[PDB]
C-alpha cells in the first residue's frame, strides 16, 4: 500500500558509478509507487545549491530506459560551495521552496558526510531563512527536519559498513574485460603486464581482480610489501614462469604504498622487473574505463533493492532516528547508522596512515579479509616435496556452469599443496563408471580460471545405474575423497552414494559438493557457481531484445529462460531489465493473471514507452507455454501492440565467467579442499572403514555472511526432488520488487 | 580437388593481432584440404632460427577451438638473429631439414620484408649448407626455391596495398568498447577525455575511431595541425559544448606529430585544454587492450578468406613469380607483389618525415582519404546563418538496424549545414501517412551515433495503401526530397513512389535509399548498414553455444538465424564460428544432403572435438524446419551424439553498432545527403514538376572499392521481389570456404 | 484392411533410409493410374519421427509428383456400437470368466484360513489358440514388457510381411 503525502529528493554525487541509474530509477519508482512526490536534483550538490531548473519532479517515465545505462542521467558534479555554510543554507532554501522534506543521496563517504551534516544543523538553516524572511514560520515548523537515506555509490568499495558499494561489481567487469584482453597479447609474446586499477585508498578492486585473474603479484595499501620484497617478487615471477607459465599479470592499486607509507608507482614495478628479471614488460594504466559501460546484473539488482529500501528508510524515519545507510550484509540488505559507517571508514584511513596495516585489513571487513586470506593462501602455495597418503577425485556433474573451471583449478592446487594425489574424472559419474580418471599436475590446470564450460566435461548421469562399476574405480585408483562440482545431479549423486554406504564398503569416502549450476536450484547454498554469469548473459540479451522492441515501436516480447522448475534466473533477470512480468513456477498463475498482465501491457502503449517484455521460465507452467503467451498477447493486444517470442537457450550458460564466478569458484575450490583435507584426517588408518558418518558428505555454500557445510542427507527435508530444487528459497521476496518496478 | 604433395610452413611474427588464429586455422585447413603437409612454426622467426620442437606438423585438430581466441596460439616473438645472415642461414637449414618449401608469414611490413629477403637469397643459403656438408646436393636442387605468401597481420592498418590488415577491425572494437565506457562517465561529470590509441606511425585507428565516436578533435601523423591550432581547438571544444553538448572526446594517435614533425603528447593536450578552457579533463592511455580479446566477425571471415588465398598463392606460385601479399581491394580479395607493397609503405613513412603530409594522406590509400575527407567535412560543418529553399524528410523503414541512427545523425547535420529544413518522420511510411513529421535541429540528433535500434521508429508498411495521404503530407510540409534509411521495404517503398510519379504530381520528389538492414537483402549495395552488427551479434552467441556444446561433450546444435530468404547472415556467421553446415535458401538441399551432413557429424565424434554446430536460415527450406533438423540429427546420431536447438531472434539486431556500422552509417548519411543536395539543384524552380526522371530516385551503396548510386527502377531486373532479395549476390563464393573449413 | 503403402510400428525398427525408400516407392506409383498413397503411423512408433516429420519428408521428396496431408484418427477408433465379434466375444468371456470365478471361489474353504492366497487364483482369461486359456497374472510377468505396456512376443508380427507384399515391396 501507499503511505506518503510527502516529497523525496534524490541526487547522485561525487565519483560516478555504473549502477546509479538503476538506483535513481528504483528510488523514483518506489517513491511514486508509495505515493510520494519524487524530485531529481541534477548535478549533485551543485544543483542543490543552485536549485531552480536543477530541481524538477519525476514521473514513472522520467527514469525510463536508464537501468542499462552507466554513469548517471542526473549527473554528479562536485560542489565546494556545499562544503561552506553559505552554500549549505541555500541548499536548505531550495529544498523547502519545492517542499522537499526527505533526501536520498547516492554517493561515497564524502558525499554522505555532507548529508549527515545537513541534517545535524538543518533546523538552524531553516531558522536563518525565517530570520531574513525568505520563508514563513509555518513552513519552518513543517519542513523542520530532513531525512537522509544514504545509498553508497562508488567503484572502490571504500565503505566499511558494506560488502558491495553500488558500482564495484561493474568496475570488476570492466577490469576483467581488460585482463581478458591483455592475457591474449601477453600470452602470445610471453610478456609481463603491470595493470594499474582505481583503488584510491581502498585495495578492493585490486585484490578482487588479482584473485579473479590469477595475478602473480598484488599491491594493496592495506597490506604493503615487507622490506626487501623486490627479491621475493622476482622469485615469484621467476617461479610461475619456470613452472610452465608464459605471461605474468601484476595488479597495482593506484593508491599503493610501501611498508613506510611512501607511494609505489607502476613505473617503478616495470623498471624493477626489466632490470632484475630481463622479462619483456609493459604498463597499462587502465583508467576511467572502470567507471563506465553498462552495469552488471548484480549492480542493477542491488541498486534496485538498495533504492527500494532507501525510499522505505526515508518515509519510516523519525526526527529521533539517526540517518541511515542501506547496505549488504551477505544475501540480503541491512540498514546502518550513517555516523557510525563514516567513522568506521575514517578509522581505516587513519589505521593505514598510522602504519597499522593489520588493523586496516581487519577493519575493511570480513569480506575483505576472506578474499585477502585466499589470495595470501594461493600466493604462498607450491607443489610440495614431502607428499601424502591420500587420493582425491574431482568430478563435474550437470550442465556446464561458468566457474566450474575456477573451482577445479583452486581444488587441484589446494589439493596438490596439501600433498594429495588429485585425480580429475571426465564426464562426471559416467566418467567414474567408465574409468575416465587421470592424475593431474600443477601445469595441467593452468589458465582454467577464465574459461566457460567445463574442461573435465560433465553429464546428467546419476551414479546408481553404474554403481557396481563406480565402486570398482574408487577401489582401483584408491580414491579416499570425492569433490563434485555441479548442479542438482551432483547433490542427488553424492546422496545416492550416502544412501548406498550401507550397501558398499567403498562409499565410505569423504564427499563434498560445490554447487555449480546456472539455475540456483542446488539445496544448501543460497548462490550456485555460474548463476551470476547466467543472469548477466540473459540480462545482456534482454537489453538487445528491449532495444529491438523500442525501435520497432509497439512490440511486446515473450522471452523464455533456462531456470528448470526454479524461477531464480527469470526473477533476477526480470529485475535487471525491468521486465513487465516474469512467469515462474513458484508463483501460481492462470488466465486471470495473464489477462491482467495483458491489460496492463495495453495501458502502457498510451505512454511514450511503447514496448513490453515478459520473461517465462521454461517450466513455469504445464500448459501455458511461450507459444500460449504469444497467442494470448497477440490477440488481446491486436490493434494496440504486436508480439514476438525469443527462447534464450544455452546462451545463458555464458562465455567467460563474471568476476563473482571467478572469485567464488576459486574461493569454494579452496574452502572445499581445506574441509576435504581436514575431514580426511578426522578419520583413522586402523581397524575401520573411513568416514561412514553423515558429517562426512556435505555441500559447501554461501549461506548468509559466509559459508556453511551442510550434510547431503540432512538437506533431504529442505529439498523437493520432483521439481529438483529447495523448498524455501531466499529470493522470493525479490518478486515483489519486480512487480513494483513493473507498475503493479 | 587436392593438388600438392608438398609442405607449407606458417608463422605469425611481430606485433600480434587478434585474427592471427583465424588466419593460421584457415592456412592449416586449406593446406591439408588441398593435400599439403602443414607445419606450425612456433614463436615467429625465433623458432624458425631455432627449429627443433619449434617446427611441428599440424593436423585438422591442431588448429581447433582457436578461431574465437585473440593473439596467436603459435606465438610471435621478435628475432634480431633473423635480421642477421647467420640466423637467416639456420632458418633455411631448419626448413629444409623438415622439407618445408612454401612459407606463409602472418605479420606487418617488417616481418614481411624479412620473408622477401629470405627468398631473394634462398639459393645461396642452400649453397652454403651444401658447401659445409649439412645437406646433400639433391636436396638443394629439390628445395631450390622458397615461396612466400604474406598475410598482413597488424592492428595499425599500416600497409599501403590494402584496405584492412588482419586485426584492425577488432582493435576498433576494443577502442569503441573503451569509448562506450568513457562516454558515460565523461557525460555525467561533463569532462573532456584525451584518448591515446596505438597508431604507431599510421593514423588509421585514430581517424576511424574518432569518426566512429564523434570525437571533437583528432591528431593523426599524416595530417598534423597547422600553426596556432591551439586557438582553433579551444574554439572547437568551446563551440560543441556551447551548442548543447556536455563531454568532449579528443583522439590522439601515439605517433602524433605537429606541422614541424616534433611529437605531440596526450599530456600536452590535457594541459592545454585545462589552461585555455578551464574544463575538467582526463587522459586515458588506452594500451594493449587494443591488441587483445576475441576477434570481430570481419577479422575471422577476413582471416579465413585471406588464409585460404595465401595457401593457393603458395601452391600455384613459380620461381619466376614475385612473392605475394593477399589483401582486400573492396568487396573481395586481391593478390599483390610483396616488393611493391613494402616500398609503397616505406614511401609513406618517407613522405611523412619529409613534411609532405598531403602525399602521406593520398598514398595511405583511397580508404584512408574518404574517411579523412568525411572527418574533415563533419569537423568543418556548422548550423548556417544563410538558410536555403529546400525541405527534406528522413524516414526509417523495415526492422531497426544498427547504424540507422548514425546515418540519420550524419544526414541531419549534412542537411542542416547545406542549409535545408530537414524533417524526421516517425514510424516510416505509416508516419508519412499519419503526418508524424517534425523539423529537427543540430541538438535534437546529438549522441545518436552509438545507439542501436531506431530513434525515429520504423515500420514494414509500404506506401501504396496510404498513398493519397502520403502525397498530402509531402504537399503540406512542402517536402522536396526523401531520404529513406532501411531494408527491402525502403527500396520497394521508394519504387512504389517512382511507379506512381505518373499518377501523382507530388511524387516528383528527389529520393535516396540508404540500405539499412540486418539481412543484406537490399538490391544495389553489396553491404547493408547493420549487417556487420548482425554477424557480430550472432557470432558472439554461437561462440557461447559452442562452448556450451564443448563442455556438454557430444552435443550437436541446430541454430536458427534471421536472414529472411537471404542466406548472408547464416553464411558469414558460419565462417566466423566454423559451423559444420549452414542451411541457406540460395543452396538447394534435401534429405540426401542432410543425411550426408549427419554422417559427417557422426564421424567427427570419434575425434577429440566432440561437438557440432549447424546454422539454419529461418526460411532456408519450406518443410525442413529447425525442428525437422533436430529430429533428424537426434535420430541418426542416437548412440553417438545428442542434439539441441536455439533460435537466435532479435538478439541479432544487436546492441550498439560495430565500428564499421558507425563509420559506414555516418559516411552513407553524408554521401547520400551530398547527392540529395546536388540532384536537388540539378532541377529548376520555373514552369515544371521537379525531378520526374529515373536518375533522381536511387539507392546508395558500397559496390566495389567505393560507392555507387543505382536508380530504383533500374534495379528491378537485379531484384527478386517474391523472396525480397537481389538475384545475384557477391558472397555465394564464401559458401565454398565454409564447406572447406567444415571438413567437406 | 485398407491396402496401406506402409504402416510404421514400434515393433519394427525404421529410420530415414526406410522412410526415403518408402517415399521413392510412393513416387514411382504416381506414374500408374492409382495416383494416391496411404501410410499409417502408430502414435508411438518412433520417438522423433512424428506424423509431422513424415508429412514434411513426403511433402518435400514428393514435390513435383504428389502433395501430402495428415489425419490423426483419435478416439474415433474407440468406435460406436461393438462389432458382432466384440458382442459374442464379450458375452462369451463374461460367462467363461464368471464360471471360472465361481469354480475357484469354491476351490477355497470357509475355516481357519485366508482364502485363495495361491498364484493360481489371479488370472487373465483370453482366446489363446482354438479356445480360451486362463493365465496367472504373476506367471505373465516374463511374457510382459511393462515399460512399453505390451507382451514381448505377439502373434500378428507375421502379418507385417503380408502388408508389405500387398503394398508392392
Ligand atoms: C565481486 C563479487 O563478489 N561480486 C558479486 C556478484 C554477484 C553476487 C555477489 C557478489 O554477491 C552476493 C549477492 C547478493 C545478491 C542479492 C541480495 C539481495 C537481492 C538480490 C541479490 C541478487 C542477485 C543476482 C546477481 C547475480 O546472480 N546477489 N549476490 C551475488
Ligand atoms: C572499420 C571498417 O570499415 N570495418 C569493416 C567491417 C566490416 C566490413 C568492412 C569494413 O568492410 C568491407 C568488407 C568486406 C567483407 C568481405 C570480403 C570478402 C569476404 C567476406 C567479407 C565479409 C564479411 C562479413 C563481415 C561483417 O558483415 N566484409 N566487409 C565488411
Ligand atoms: N565535511 C563536509 N561537509 C559538507 N560537504 C562535504 C563534506 N565532505 C564532502 N562534502 C561534499 O561531498 C561532495 C562530493 O564528495 P567527494 O569527496 O567529491 O566524492 P565522494 O562522495 O566519493 O567522497 C563534495 O562536492 C562536497 O560537497
Ligand atoms: N630487413 C630485414 N631483414 C630481415 N629481417 C627483418 C628485416 N626487417 C625486419 N625483419 C624481421 O621481422 C621481424 C618482426 O618485425 P617487427 O618490425 O618486429 O614487426 P612488424 O612485422 O610489425 O614490422 C623481426 O623480428 C625481424 O626478424
Ligand atoms: O537445472 P539443471 O538440471 O541443473 O541443469 C542446468 C541446465 O539444464 C537446462 O535446463 C538445460 O539442460 P540440457 O543441456 O540437458 O538441455 C538449463 O536450465 C541449464 O543450463
Ligand atoms: O529481412 P527484412 O524484411 O529486411 O527484415 C529484417 C528483419 O526482419 C526479420 O526477418 C524479422 O522481422 P519481424 O521483426 O517483423 O519479426 C529479421 O530477419 C530481421 O531483423
Ligand atoms: O576520476 P577522478 O576524478 O580522477 O577520481 C579518481 C577516483 O575516483 C574514483 O573513480 C571513484 O571514487 C576512484 O576510483 C578514482 O581513483
Ligand atoms: O606493443 P609494443 O611492443 O609496444 O608495440 C607497439 C606497437 O605495436 C603495435 O601494437 C602493432 O604493430 C602498435 O599498435 C603499437 O604502437
Author numbering:
A (entry chain D), B (entry chain A): 11 to 754
C (entry chain E): 586 to 754
List passages from the publication reporting this PDB structure.
Mammals have three PFK1 genes, which encode the liver (PFKL), platelet (PFKP), and muscle (PFKM) isoforms. At the level of transcription, the dominant isoform of PFK1 expressed in most human cells is PFKP, although PFKM dominates in muscle cells, and PFKL is the dominant isoform in immune cells. PFKL is a negative regulator of the phagocytic oxidative burst. Here, we use two unbiased chemical proteomic strategies to show that small-molecule LDC7559, or a more potent designed analog NA-11, inhibits the NOX2-dependent oxidative burst in neutrophils by activating the glycolytic enzyme phosphofructokinase-1 liver type (PFKL) and dampening flux through the pentose phosphate pathway.
Cryoelectron microscopy (cryo-EM) of PFKL in the presence of ATP, F6P, and NA-11 revealed that PFKL primarily formed stacked pairs of tetramers. Structures of the stacked tetramers and masked tetramer were in the same conformation (Cα root-mean-square deviation [RMSD] 0.65 Å). We identified three residues in the NA-11-binding pocket that are unique to PFKL: K315, V545, and V582. These data confirm that K315, V545, or V582 in PFKL impart specificity for NA-11 activation. NA-11 binding in the nucleotide effector site mimics allosteric activation by AMP or ADP, inducing the active, R-state conformation. A high-resolution structure of PFKL confirmed binding of NA-11 to the AMP/ADP allosteric activation site and explained why NA-11 failed to agonize phosphofructokinase-1 platelet type (PFKP) or muscle type (PFKM).
